[PDB]
Design a protein around this nucleic acid. Structure first.
Lengths: 96, 806
DNA sequence: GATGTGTAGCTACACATC
DNA sequence: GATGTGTAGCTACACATC
């Protein structure tokens, strides 16, 4: 019926963003004009080379490695077409 | 004197070079002039000292700040000096003017200067220090050991930097040291670097030999879309035909599979264009040769690929015909024949269907010649090759017109004799039946013919010996199930099925061999979909199959129960001589609760969602238990289950207002229960620990507002804007808000409440009530300041939308 | 972490170019 | 033929702020 189609067009088409569940769901709807290279800097501009001190500048050793390797999980492609049709008789579908 | 003159000479070049790229080539020609003049006076180190000082002026600049023209100027100056050196060595037998020494000394001195800010506290300094090295790294020439070990050490530390921007410059500098140790560092970042753009930088600039290629192509499943796209747009394109010779066929086969079915159109089009354009043109348009690269045993992807090729190339389409010259038939041409013919029908290509293909009677001739050549024999990879051709031709036969009566009757004799072979493979049984179904156009005709084929096989085993061999029962139950799958009339109209059911279907359910019993259930289930009374009498037996059965049996028996309900509704339970619905509800509990059988959990969840959407199941408490399993910590490791719920719960909530409501009423309590699970889980300490196996209550809450947002309904009456489904939910959350004790949780809820949708059309009374509870929380139990602002933001809007009283 | 704003990397069609 | 280059506009990310 239209219910299937009405449901089919809306959902399969670009509601994939949340296909993984979990947090992975979005559903989200001049300066420095110039420099003067001649003007002096008298030994305290070159302090650009200061030491880190207590600034961090490094990754926490936690995030340097991730077992997931930032890959997708396997895609089981759950689709509206898969929910409207029967299990043991895919050709036929429930009241829809 | 001289020293000051050098500074001014060099300072003036920089002062005008920062503004425009216009006169850079002149600036470079001038710098080499100032330098050469400075060294002969003996002031070489004066030029290097002032050149260094002036470059230190640009390091503090932010990225993408236009005064990186100096960066582009330094790179051009280093490059030209090296060019003159290389050239000078070729021109002259012996370098007489110490040309190499000056370059070797200037570059070493300059790198060590900038490396003074490689660990600077300033984000921007660290960036441009690596940027400078990246653009001059290739033209450093030769460096002594000490300087070499100082660059790899400094770079290997900055690959783990805070800012991703500098890490991208860290790989760029490393791509120049590959060909040893540099590759290992790149291989570690292409997999473990959180930034999608660092993965990309390492990906594109890695060496791409026989060693690194597995790590490069692995990015075809990177979470980022650009990265998944570039493996097709650039890597596999730049390789050209190297993909067919250098990549292993199985890795190759999976790549095109992922691409053609990727969830993003951008990635799909990238892979399509790689096949329909780059590779096809690379093979000089020989369509058949391309199919040999795309292994056809993996047909499903070859269909997506060829179906994509036809859309990108309609001209090649019209050309191919199949004259009676069938002597040249191979798996590729057999596959093409199928793909071309079914592609024509799906798009109504009138002209091509007419003459490009042989007549039905003529096709049955060829189809038979292959069956004889395989099954009436008396080599092995010839068997698989023939079975495949029979399959392909049989898929096109299922959809042949058969206007000719002789053709219809000729083909019928070929499939009838094929289905009678006890040695026919299951793929050819499946398609063989489908063709016989297409030929009869009379269900009873199709049934009477299939039963004969089945019973003949059954009798020939019994008579040739009183219940038939187990190996034969399999041959009949597989043929039987593929027949029933296409039967859509009550059992009472086909008397043979009831007799087929009396002699091996029901016996099979009583068998001891697991594989036969599973087949006997599938046929039994298929029969129940035809006769309601039959379903009723077996509901108890199926329920017990799902209770005590092994994993595989539990699996098939439960799908039958879901399909019985999908067809017969609630008429099979809660009545005289039937099973009680609660007795089955509990069966679904145990399965959806069975952590030890994940595959069974899937169909229990996928199925339970099917029956709620169909409105045969409606108990709220069960629905509540349904959602809690999705968020539960124990199920978070079942990817198939997570993806199932991730799709099904949205469609149920958005399918119809009456369904979204059921979430609103139960959502609040769900959040409460899941808050208790998470909280209790953070405190408990158990060697296995893992407090991260559960979504934080702020994301759970967030997720619940998305499902209850009336703007996501598929149907928009225009009167759906005055829908309070989301308001009543939040009220239910402000009431259960009292019952939460921990502060961080009470913060996770109150900081996200402003995602709710507010509209003037919404009912006044229910907006008022929502405001009353907002005030009560705001003025009594006092919150954090960030939470307070969030709650005051809501009240303000309420106070405004409410204020439209006119 | 919940906001709101900025951008890399295409994507399409139009033409000039060698 | 195939490569340039002009425009524009799109979407998932990264970025910024507190």
């Amino acid at each position: 019926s239209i219910f299937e189609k009405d449901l089919m067009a809306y959902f399969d088409e670009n509601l994939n963003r949340n296909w993984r569940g979990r947090e992975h769901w979005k559903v989200r709807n001049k300066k420095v004009l110039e420099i003067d290279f001649f003007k002096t800097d008298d030994s305290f501009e070159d302090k650009v080379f200061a030491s880190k001190g207590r600034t961090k500048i490094d990754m926490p050793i936690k995030n340097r490695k991730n077992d997931t390797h930032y890959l997708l999980p396997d895609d089981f492609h759950f689709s509206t077409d898969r929910i409207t049709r029967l299990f043991i008789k895919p050709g036929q579908k429930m009241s829809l | 004197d001289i020293n000051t003159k050098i500074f001014n000479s060099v300072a003036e070049v920089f002062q005008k070079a920062q503004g425009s790229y216009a006169g850079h080539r002149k600036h470079i020609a001038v710098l080499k002039k100032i330098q050469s003049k400075a060294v002969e006076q003996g002031y070489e180190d004066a030029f290097n000292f002032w050149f260094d000082k002036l470059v230190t002026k640009i390091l503090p600049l932010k990225k993408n700040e236009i005064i990186d023209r100096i960066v582009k100027l330094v790179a051009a100056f280093i490059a030209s000096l090296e060019r003159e050196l290389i050239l000078a060595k070729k021109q002259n037998y012996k370098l007489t003017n110490d040309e190499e020494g000056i370059f070797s000394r200037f570059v070493d001195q300059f790198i060590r200067h900038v490396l003074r800010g490689v660990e600077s506290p300033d984000k921007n300094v660290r960036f441009r220090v690596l940027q400078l090295l990246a653009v001059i790294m290739d033209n450093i020439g030769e460096i002594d050991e000490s300087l070499f070990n100082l660059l790899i050490l400094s770079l290997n530390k900055r690959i783990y930097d805070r800012e991703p921007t500098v890490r991208i410059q860290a790989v760029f500098c490393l791509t120049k040291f590959q060909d040893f140790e540099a590759t290992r560092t790149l291989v570690a970042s292409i997999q473990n670097d959180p930034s999608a753009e660092v993965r990309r930088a390492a990906m594109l600039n890695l060496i791409n030999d026989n060693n690194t290629r597995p790590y490069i192509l692995e990015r075809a499943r990177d979470v980022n879309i650009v990265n998944r796209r570039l493996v097709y747009s650039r890597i596999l394109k730049s390789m050209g035909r190297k993909c067919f010779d250098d990549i292993e066929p199985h890795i190759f086969d999976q790549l095109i599979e992922w691409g053609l079915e990727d969830r993003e159109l951008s990635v799909r089009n990238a892979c399509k264009r790689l096949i329909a354009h780059d590779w096809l043109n690379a093979l000089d348009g020989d369509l058949i040769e391309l199919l040999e690269k795309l292994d056809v045993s993996r047909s499903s992807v070859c269909v997506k690929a060829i179906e994509a090729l036809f859309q990108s190339r309609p001209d090649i389409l019209s050309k191919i015909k199949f004259p009676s010259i069938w002597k040249d038939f191979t798996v590729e041409i057999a596959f093409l024949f199928r793909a071309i013919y079914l592609y024509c029908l799906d798009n109504n290509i009138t002209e091509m269907l007419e003459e490009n293909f042989p007549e039905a009677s003529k096709l049955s001739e060829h189809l038979n010649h292959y069956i004889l050549l395989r099954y009436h024999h008396n080599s092995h990879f010839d068997y698989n090759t023939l079975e495949f051709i029979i399959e392909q031709l049989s898929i096109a036969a299922e959809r042949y017109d058969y206007s000719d009566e002789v053709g219809r009757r000729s083909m019928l004799t070929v499939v009838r004799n094929m289905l009678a072979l006890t040695t026919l493979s299951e793929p050819l049984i499946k398609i063989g039946i489908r063709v016989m179904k297409s030929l009869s156009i009379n269900e009873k005709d199709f049934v009477t013919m299939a039963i004969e084929i089945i019973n003949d096989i059954r009798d020939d085993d019994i008579e040739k010996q009183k219940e038939a061999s187990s190996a034969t029962i399999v041959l009949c139950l597989t043929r039987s199930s593929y027949m029933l799958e296409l039967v859509n009339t009550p059992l009472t109209e086909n008397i043979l099925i009831a007799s087929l059911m009396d002699t091996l279907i029901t016996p099979a359910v009583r068998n001891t061999a697991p594989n036969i019993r599973e087949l006997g259930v599938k046929n039994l289930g298929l029969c129940c979909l035809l006769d309601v009374k039959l379903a009723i009498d077996n509901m108890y037996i199926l329920g017990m199959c799902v209770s005590k059965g092994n994993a595989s049996l539990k699996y098939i028996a439960l799908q039958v129960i879901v399909d019985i309900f999908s067809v017969h509704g609630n008429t099979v339970v809660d009545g005289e001589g039937k099973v009680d619905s609660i007795s089955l509800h509990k069966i679904f509990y145990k399965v959806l609760k069975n952590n030890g059988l994940p595959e069974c959990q899937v169909i229990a969840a996928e199925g339970l969602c099917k029956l709620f959407l169909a409105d045969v199941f409606t108990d709220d408490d069960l629905f509540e238990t349904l959602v809690l399993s999705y968020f539960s910590p124990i199920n978070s490791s079942n990817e198939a289950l997570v993806q199932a719920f991730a799709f099904c719960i949205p469609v149920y909530c958005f399918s119809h207002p009456a369904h979204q409501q059921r979430m609103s009423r139960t959502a609040a309590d769900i959040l409460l229960r899941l808050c208790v699970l998470w909280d209790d889980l953070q405190s408990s300490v158990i060697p296995e620990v893992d407090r991260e196996a559960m979504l934080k209550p702020n994301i759970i809450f967030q997720q619940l507002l998305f499902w209850t947002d009336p703007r996501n309904l598929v149907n928009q009456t225009g009167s759906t804007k005055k829908d309070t489904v989301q308001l009543t939910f939040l009220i239910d959350v402000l009431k259960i808000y009292a019952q939460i004790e921990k502060k961080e949780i009470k913060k996770m809820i109150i900081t996200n409440i402003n995602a709710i949708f507010l509209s003037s059309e919404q009912d006044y009374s229910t907006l008022k009530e929502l405001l009353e509870y907002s005030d009560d929380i705001a003025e009594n139990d006092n919150l954090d300041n960030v939470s307070k602002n969030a709650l005051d933001k809501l009240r303000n809007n309420l106070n405004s939308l409410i204020e439209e009283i006119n």
